[PDB]
Design a protein around this ligand. Sequence first.
Ligand SMILES: Cc1cc2nc3c(=O)[nH]c(=O)nc-3n(C[C@@H](O)[C@H](O)[C@H](O)COP(=O)(O)OP(=O)(O)OC[C@H]3O[C@@H](n4cnc5c(N)ncnc54)[C@H](O)[C@@H]3O)c2cc1C
Ligand SMILES: Cc1cc2nc3c(=O)[nH]c(=O)nc-3n(C[C@@H](O)[C@H](O)[C@H](O)COP(=O)(O)OP(=O)(O)OC[C@H]3O[C@@H](n4cnc5c(N)ncnc54)[C@H](O)[C@@H]3O)c2cc1C
Lengths: 391, 391
Amino acid sequence: MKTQVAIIGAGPSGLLLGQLLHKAGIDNVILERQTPDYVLGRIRAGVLEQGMVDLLREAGVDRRMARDGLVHEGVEIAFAGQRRRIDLKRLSGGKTVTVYGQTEVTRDLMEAREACGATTVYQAAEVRLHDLQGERPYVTFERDGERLRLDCDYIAGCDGFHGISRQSIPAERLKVFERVYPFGWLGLLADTPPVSHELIYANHPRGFALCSQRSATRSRYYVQVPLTEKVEDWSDERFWTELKARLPAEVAEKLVTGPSLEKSIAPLRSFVVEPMQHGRLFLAGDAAHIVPPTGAKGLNLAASDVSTLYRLLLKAYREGRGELLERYSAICLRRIWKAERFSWWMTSVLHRFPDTDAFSQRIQQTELEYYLGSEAGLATIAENYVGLPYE
Amino acid sequence: MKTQVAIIGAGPSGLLLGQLLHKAGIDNVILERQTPDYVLGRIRAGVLEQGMVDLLREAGVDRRMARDGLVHEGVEIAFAGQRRRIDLKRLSGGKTVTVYGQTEVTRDLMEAREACGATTVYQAAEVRLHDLQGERPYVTFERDGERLRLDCDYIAGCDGFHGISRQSIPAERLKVFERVYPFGWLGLLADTPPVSHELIYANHPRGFALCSQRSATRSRYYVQVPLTEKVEDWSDERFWTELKARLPAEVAEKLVTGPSLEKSIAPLRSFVVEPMQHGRLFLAGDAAHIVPPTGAKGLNLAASDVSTLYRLLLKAYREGRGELLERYSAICLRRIWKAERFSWWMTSVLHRFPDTDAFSQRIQQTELEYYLGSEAGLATIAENYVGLPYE
Ligand SMILES: Cc1cc2nc3c(=O)[nH]c(=O)nc-3n(C[C@@H](O)[C@H](O)[C@H](O)COP(=O)(O)OP(=O)(O)OC[C@H]3O[C@@H](n4cnc5c(N)ncnc54)[C@H](O)[C@@H]3O)c2cc1C
Ligand SMILES: Cc1cc2nc3c(=O)[nH]c(=O)nc-3n(C[C@@H](O)[C@H](O)[C@H](O)COP(=O)(O)OP(=O)(O)OC[C@H]3O[C@@H](n4cnc5c(N)ncnc54)[C@H](O)[C@@H]3O)c2cc1C
């Protein structure tokens, strides 16, 4: 078989890229290691930047989002016995963010793809990439036990952190930047009303806590935990008690608790690889970079990489301007580094780090006081949180 | 002998406090360990916030400053092959800073004090403080070999980092926060025209460099150096060559060099003690806190502590409101911590730290790019640099 663009991975990155390309008349095949059900089982992110919202509308997959998504104009930060609200709309010049689950976004895209008849091969095992620096690269994989070959012009690696695509680039061509945090986030999804209409990030002496939501009757909470903890050590009862201990009393008393629909621990990490391409292979999303979830940039960076790759492929196919594809990494990296800096800052000011001396604790508190108390300070948070403009 | 306020130390803190109190009719005696000449030999700071400028005018010691001081509306930051100017006046809402040497400020104050006839005892050896928690505290010292006693109501410890006053508070009553940096600054004073009309802070791979001035024919430069270096290892020739290697070529080529008038190495440190008082003793300036010079806040924080202490003593003496003095530490610490946070930030983004991994170097560069490229980012630098308003 042959196609124009081969896409490895059927998470939001690959599905979004595949839908945009399909609509533009550029044929693409998506290869996914897992089953549709397995992909839809992942909870993950819940905050979308306007750029991604617009991209979804452009891919023609925004009906349910427009209907069910919640537009937020602010967010709160609680620390040292106080709650500070950042008016994102006012401080960013009218921009806002939309709360709509990643699971929902993925489901919307999967439906759209199924309906349009574009090619998607689930359970594509042992995917391998070949002749990346040739005129005609190709992908091989096994279906049922048979090894198939897919010829193409370009390959988009949208296979996440553990995908085969980043592994397929000669190690000596890549420059990796990484930072692992000494803690993870224990998240819990519950069919209960959110404790607030906006998100509450809380820096507490016992550790970080985050109150989020998915809808009016679905909440998503997180608590910072050491990397040594295992989810089976945390009953729902234990989680709720801990969450409450980390929240302002007035918030903790309004909290409606209930049984978890999902509960898991995800460790924190920062990761960037440079460049993000090699020959006919272009990396996008988690395959190229990782940000701690504190700033809600993961899914959002996948969106901007895809937007950039899609527009460059359009120039290549529609206008015969293939040379522009060489600029992919430079364009994406500029946005990526700024989002990595913000996520890192967000993480350092909201979490409790092990082995912190007195000076550092005081500086962490002063960072909060300064940034949340100055108009210019609030503005730096807001503009970064709503998301810097696409290039 | 007896006085109302005993002041330990004749650097800018004590002299400024003594002049303000004198003018307000509150008698004060200043005790200094060194000679007038030794004090005037210190070069140190060169940038004054408007608050300090106004305080000097209030103490009636601003003629020469108004005449010789240089008002700066901006400052530049050079990094990764580029020079970025921060328009302080525009970004701070019309505020500026004044370049007038600390040596000059000290000389102006010493003259004013000498002329008004207020008491100053130089070469006051082995100063000791007594009955700090009594109704009537006192200071003892040796002059000529004779041990004298000075009775007073209050004692202001303006004796710097190594003064006897902070040492006189029961250690268990103080909470210290400290951070030592792995480098020092090698400074050089030269009788040459400045390379720029505004300051240039430079982050270079070889290390930090700063181009400052004292007048139109007097420059002050600094270069970051390891704590293992000794000034005798640095000839003028070696310094100039190193400075040039750390500056943008166009700047380096305009540089007029010459023999040093002064040259020395000063290590970097952050230090805060809480509280800043004990009984009838109040600490001010370097006796209570230290900031790395990167943000030019040392002399400026001494000024705000003195302004706060002076105004509280005025209420106590003029209005009989002695209770207000209990609020001294709380008021000062709020400003101190914000200035410590800024000086720390300034230091971390402009210096080259030993043992920095790839991720951190990239984040340091991105911090610069973000802050110097965003209106909100520039504003956070400007408002902090001109100095936050006195409380
Ligand atoms: C465990 C986890 C929890 C997260 N939680 C949060 C959160 O709480 N908040 C937040 O803001 N962000 C969170 N994120 C970030 C998340 O939103 C990601 O940024 C987002 O899923 C990235 O989307 P993709 O790049 O499409 O990658 P994804 O990882 O979502 O998808 C990649 C796809 O490639 C497939 N694939 C893998 N290897 C393959 C191969 N060899 N061949 C074929 N297919 C292959 C995978 O099966 C997967 O379907 C989380 C991420 C993870 C990994
Ligand atoms: C070596 C050095 C270099 C510096 N360089 C810079 C720079 O380049 N840029 C910048 O922005 N800042 C710099 N600073 C900071 C500087 O500006 C200080 O913040 C400022 O001098 C503090 O003023 P005071 O609190 O009055 O203390 P000071 O240290 O100036 O004065 C305290 C006085 O108390 C006296 N004293 C000490 N112990 C005594 C005792 N037991 N009895 C009696 N008298 C006693 C001392 O002799 C001294 O005269 C530097 C500081 C130092 C120490």
